[PDB]
Amino acid sequence: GRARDAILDALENLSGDELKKFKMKLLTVQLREGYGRIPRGALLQMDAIDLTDKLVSYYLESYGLELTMTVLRDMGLQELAEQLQTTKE
Amino acid sequence: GRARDAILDALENLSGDELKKFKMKLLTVQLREGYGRIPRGALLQMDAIDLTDKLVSYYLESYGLELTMTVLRDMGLQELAEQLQTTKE
Amino acid sequence: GRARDAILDALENLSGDELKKFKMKLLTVQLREGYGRIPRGALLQMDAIDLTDKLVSYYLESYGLELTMTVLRDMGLQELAEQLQTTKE
Amino acid sequence: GRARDAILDALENLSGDELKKFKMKLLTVQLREGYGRIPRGALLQMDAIDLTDKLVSYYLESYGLELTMTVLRDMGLQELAEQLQTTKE
Amino acid sequence: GRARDAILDALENLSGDELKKFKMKLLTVQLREGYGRIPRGALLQMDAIDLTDKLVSYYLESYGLELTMTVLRDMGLQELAEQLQTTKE
Amino acid sequence: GRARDAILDALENLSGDELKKFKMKLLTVQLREGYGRIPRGALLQMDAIDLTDKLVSYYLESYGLELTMTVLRDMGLQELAEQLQTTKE
Amino acid sequence: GRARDAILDALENLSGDELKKFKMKLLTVQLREGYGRIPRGALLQMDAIDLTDKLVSYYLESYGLELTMTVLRDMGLQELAEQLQTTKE
Amino acid sequence: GRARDAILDALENLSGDELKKFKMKLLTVQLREGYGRIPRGALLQMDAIDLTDKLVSYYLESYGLELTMTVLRDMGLQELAEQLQTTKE
Amino acid sequence: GRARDAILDALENLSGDELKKFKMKLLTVQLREGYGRIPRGALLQMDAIDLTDKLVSYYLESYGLELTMTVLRDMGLQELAEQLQTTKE
Amino acid sequence: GRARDAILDALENLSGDELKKFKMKLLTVQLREGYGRIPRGALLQMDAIDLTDKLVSYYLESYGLELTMTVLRDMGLQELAEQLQTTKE
Amino acid sequence: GRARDAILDALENLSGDELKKFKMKLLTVQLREGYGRIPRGALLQMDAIDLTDKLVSYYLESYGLELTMTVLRDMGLQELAEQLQTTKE
Amino acid sequence: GRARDAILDALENLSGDELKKFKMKLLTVQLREGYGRIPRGALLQMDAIDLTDKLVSYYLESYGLELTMTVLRDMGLQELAEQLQTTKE
Amino acid sequence: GRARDAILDALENLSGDELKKFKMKLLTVQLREGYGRIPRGALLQMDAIDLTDKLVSYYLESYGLELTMTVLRDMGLQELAEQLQTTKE
Amino acid sequence: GRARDAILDALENLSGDELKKFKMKLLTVQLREGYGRIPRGALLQMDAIDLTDKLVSYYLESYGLELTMTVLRDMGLQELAEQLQTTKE
Amino acid sequence: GRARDAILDALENLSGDELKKFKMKLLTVQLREGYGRIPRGALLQMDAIDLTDKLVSYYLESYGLELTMTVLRDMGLQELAEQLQTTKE
């Protein structure tokens, strides 16, 4: 599924500081019922590449891909949000 | 019964750390009446391949196969849970 | 009586360690009245094939065959228990 | 006993540094009479998951579960202390 | 006597390391007068299942069963100690 | 029949871990009707060289040789599968 | 086949971080039909040298060698991609 | 003799690294005449529990118990030295 | 002994820079005879929490607790020195 | 003569490895004149119980009993040496 | 033949990591016709000392000694290559 | 005929594992017409010394001696093959 | 060879930043034919002391020593270049 | 010989970085004739305590003790060099 | 002859790894004419104690004792070499 690769390419375009903000905010974001939550301990020491694999692991590609955008806009509208959306099509 | 082979292929796709979590959680999972429980001593030193053979040995293929998924989701929804479910059909 | 051959084929499918557990447990299992008990000395040094002949020798084929399953399940439900039961029919 | 699973889920939400503080403090915490103390050697190299199994092993689920909270608050009042308490009910 | 089977089931739930501690400690435990002591040579190479048969062989079921618990608590209070006690009733 | 020697030379080129996977998978592989199945007890403790002699003993050289490849590919396509096939010619 | 040695020499010229990216991306890369996929568990803990032997083991030298380049360019055009291509001739 | 058990309980409270220092230093410690020295080969691979049994085996309980403290202080004054001394009384 | 916990709570209230000054000065501080000195190698890489456990390990709680204050004042009179003294009472 | 029984009880308390050392050393030990030496061939395959009967057979109980201790201490001072000596009185 | 000893002394001067590289590369190195190839299974678990004995076992001392250097230089020119060559004279 | 003694001296220089390989391979080796084949049953339980006497018994010294080398090289070129050949002269 | 020690003493007199420049430039420097090139992966994470041992390992002391100066001047004429040259004499 | 203990106490007072420098320099230090050299492979992974035992093992206490100082001064004059010298007297 | 006992006591003071090196090197050591060589097969599986008896069996005590030292120094000068030499006097 190219989906895994798509997220990876974009996510890596964020600066070090914002990254923390993203990971941290993800912990407090609301998710659809029937899914689990990622343990705090792992998230704090995880890497950008690693985060990619795990992120998809918990959520399906289709639903998982959409969930990402929801958080990106939350931190403010980024060109990335739309850039990534193009992949959805 | 391809069932034995199906579980094997998927179970092997888990990382070393999660494996412990799976085996350990299995010990505390609730099972249907009329079945036995696996001894703690063996589980602690068993291998992934070995675990496959024994797992089916105690539980029937049909019921045994379903029991696995119940635990996989418990550790959180994994793509594996659904991937394996496809085999059920 | 194919019964002797049926038990033999299945019993041989057990691992070396479990075998001890089976033989040893047999000594403490409850039996119907009117039958004898097998001497401890012989059981400790007996072989899997030999055990087959002697096992039937003390108990009748019909009753002897059923007695085996009772012990197999006791060590936990094994696919063997049901597999062997099919022979009963 | 879901109790084992409840502790596990929460305990894993602590950061790596605090973990040491928790384990280390546990060694100096006062316990009710009639119970043993965990050996220092094992505690120093134990893992979060492993710690879960052993922790319950020494103390009963009911008493063991309550003992955990006593230590959590000691390190300061954490949302976890109350979150876990909900499980008590 | 189900007593032999009861001990067996529980004793097997101990990890490999603790097992040594149990066997070794048994050698230095105080016993009621009128009974013998088990030879060191055999104990060092004996197995968990074998240990079960011999353990009861030297001590009567009633007294033998109680003696076990005395040692289990000594290594610290284990859920096993109480779990096994239930069998006493 | 050089066939016995051919298999031997190649089979020995597998690592210790994969070996288990091969032997274990062989137990669940489908075989042509009119042939027997190898007892689980022996397979678990057999050696690589010994396995060679017995493997051919149950199945004819021609059919036996082909059966091996079927399993090798199953564990994934290995250079061995083709390397051994050359011997077929 | 010098092919095994050629890959080895070049692959070792990658920095530690990129290595992860390569291994991880390999898992999601599309492969020609008739071949297997490498288990996630092994890939995560494998070494650069070890990866070399296994990589060729699953895929033939000719096809295997070409597959590598396809992934190298994917991570971006590297001098290595062309440098290695020279070996193809 | 509770002496054997007393040493065991305390000795186990040392960290893995210090343990080596203790065992190694024991080899160079001066002992009273009329006693033997423990072979280097065994000491290097011995375990903490095992070391307990053997330690007492060579030296009498009374003299053996005192000898231990002499070495503990040597590695520096430890709370253990005094804690164990209490047992002497 | 709450003493271990008391020191811990206060010691942690020092800034990163002063910490070095404290540890380093401890190496050159005069101690009462009959006690050992802590190895330089360990002190340089030790942590604040770890330092707590070891600090008490070498010196008794009563004497160890007093020794700390002696050094705190040396680096200058701190509110901590008196704050900690209150614990002495 | 209880002497035969006394030796037997103690000798059996030695581990398998030390046993070899004892038997082997006995061959090179110096004996009082007027007595014979035991053939190497028999000693190598003899058992612990058997060794007891033969040991006394060659040497008188009084002198034979003392000779044993001489060798026990040689392998180092064992609690057994003194324990057995008590029997002398 | 001092040749066996010469290789041993030098080969042992390689670091753990390079060792793997050497053994692994040996498998793909070209050898003169009329000689056999060493089985992969043994090479993977062999030791440095053991490797010495076996290495000479397959190849004659004269030819075997020269073959080693050919591989050493391949991994790059090492002082060892020349140091060992001196032995040739 | 020193021939019998020559083979014996060399054959005994093989490790336990290779021995099996030799005996087993001998069963599948091609022999000149006019000679018999050794029964499988005896070969499996025979000893190295015994094998020497029987080996010569079936084949003449001259032809028998040459036949041995043919098999030694087959398992790969060994120094033994040539060492033994010297005896031929 | 004091040569190894000579380089070490001087190389350590370079500032952290220049060090990178040196190591990096070494990768692109031209070397005499018949020698190998050092892998990029190792160079990036190597230390100043370690670099010393390896640097000499690939190149002979005489030629290796001269090669160093060639690079030092390249980064500009340093007092070190001449200082080290004195060692050549 | 207190000599072994003396070295140990001082050697442990060196920081982690200098330790490497010491071990590495030892490899290139000149030694008196009639003695051996320590293998590079072991030195690289050895520990400070272990190094103590082995260091004395190769060189006599008297000569071995003096050899240490020679290297300590080489890395520069340290208070340790003189501190240790006091032990010589 | 105390000689047998002297060697035994010292030889046992070697670590497991060095032991292999000693036994293996013994096979390639040069011996005085008029003596035999020990078979490789036995040496590989022999024990330290057993090796003692056999070692003396082939060589006379006087000459045999001296031969040992020659090999000990070869593996490097050990304190053992001299320690054992004292016995010669």
CSV table of C-alpha atoms in Angstrom, one decimal, chain B residues 2-79:
chain,number,residue,atom,x,y,z
B,2,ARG,CA,-3.9,-24.9,6.5
B,3,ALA,CA,-5.1,-23.3,9.7
B,4,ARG,CA,-1.9,-24.2,11.5
B,5,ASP,CA,0.2,-22.7,8.7
B,6,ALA,CA,-2.0,-19.5,8.5
B,7,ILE,CA,-1.4,-18.6,12.1
B,8,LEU,CA,2.3,-19.3,11.9
B,9,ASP,CA,2.8,-16.9,8.9
B,10,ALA,CA,1.1,-14.0,10.7
B,11,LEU,CA,2.3,-14.6,14.3
B,12,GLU,CA,5.9,-14.4,13.0
B,13,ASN,CA,5.3,-10.8,11.8
B,14,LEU,CA,5.3,-9.4,15.4
B,15,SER,CA,8.3,-7.7,16.9
B,16,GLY,CA,10.2,-9.3,19.8
B,17,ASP,CA,8.8,-7.0,22.5
B,18,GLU,CA,5.2,-7.4,21.6
B,19,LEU,CA,5.6,-11.1,21.5
B,20,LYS,CA,6.2,-11.1,25.2
B,21,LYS,CA,3.1,-9.0,25.7
B,22,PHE,CA,1.1,-11.5,23.7
B,23,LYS,CA,2.3,-14.6,25.4
B,24,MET,CA,2.0,-13.0,28.9
B,25,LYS,CA,-1.5,-11.7,28.2
B,26,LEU,CA,-2.6,-15.1,26.9
B,27,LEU,CA,-2.1,-16.5,30.4
B,28,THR,CA,-4.7,-14.1,31.8
B,29,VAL,CA,-7.2,-14.3,29.0
B,30,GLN,CA,-10.6,-15.9,29.6
B,31,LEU,CA,-11.3,-19.2,27.8
B,32,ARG,CA,-14.4,-21.2,27.1
B,33,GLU,CA,-15.2,-23.9,29.7
B,34,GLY,CA,-14.1,-27.5,28.9
B,35,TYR,CA,-10.6,-26.6,27.9
B,36,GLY,CA,-7.3,-26.6,29.8
B,37,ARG,CA,-4.7,-23.8,30.6
B,38,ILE,CA,-1.1,-23.8,29.4
B,39,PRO,CA,1.6,-24.2,32.1
B,40,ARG,CA,3.5,-21.0,32.9
B,41,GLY,CA,6.9,-22.7,32.9
B,42,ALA,CA,6.7,-23.8,29.3
B,43,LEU,CA,5.3,-20.6,28.0
B,44,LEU,CA,8.1,-18.5,29.4
B,45,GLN,CA,10.8,-20.3,27.4
B,46,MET,CA,8.8,-21.3,24.3
B,47,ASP,CA,9.6,-20.1,20.8
B,48,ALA,CA,7.4,-18.5,18.2
B,49,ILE,CA,7.3,-21.6,15.9
B,50,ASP,CA,6.9,-24.0,18.8
B,51,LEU,CA,4.1,-21.8,20.2
B,52,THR,CA,2.3,-22.4,17.0
B,53,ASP,CA,2.2,-26.2,17.2
B,54,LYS,CA,1.2,-26.2,20.9
B,55,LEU,CA,-1.4,-23.5,20.6
B,56,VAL,CA,-3.4,-25.5,18.2
B,57,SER,CA,-2.7,-28.7,20.1
B,58,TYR,CA,-4.8,-27.6,23.1
B,59,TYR,CA,-7.6,-25.9,21.1
B,60,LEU,CA,-9.4,-27.2,18.0
B,61,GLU,CA,-8.5,-25.5,14.7
B,62,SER,CA,-11.9,-23.8,14.3
B,63,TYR,CA,-12.2,-22.6,17.9
B,64,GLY,CA,-8.4,-22.2,18.3
B,65,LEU,CA,-8.2,-19.9,15.3
B,66,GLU,CA,-10.9,-17.6,16.5
B,67,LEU,CA,-9.4,-17.4,20.0
B,68,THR,CA,-6.2,-15.9,18.6
B,69,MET,CA,-8.0,-13.0,17.0
B,70,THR,CA,-9.7,-12.2,20.3
B,71,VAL,CA,-6.3,-11.6,21.9
B,72,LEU,CA,-4.8,-9.7,18.9
B,73,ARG,CA,-7.5,-7.1,19.1
B,74,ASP,CA,-7.1,-6.9,22.8
B,75,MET,CA,-3.5,-5.6,22.5
B,76,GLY,CA,-5.1,-3.1,20.2
B,77,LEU,CA,-6.6,-3.3,16.7
B,78,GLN,CA,-3.9,-4.6,14.3
B,79,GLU,CA,-3.9,-4.9,10.6
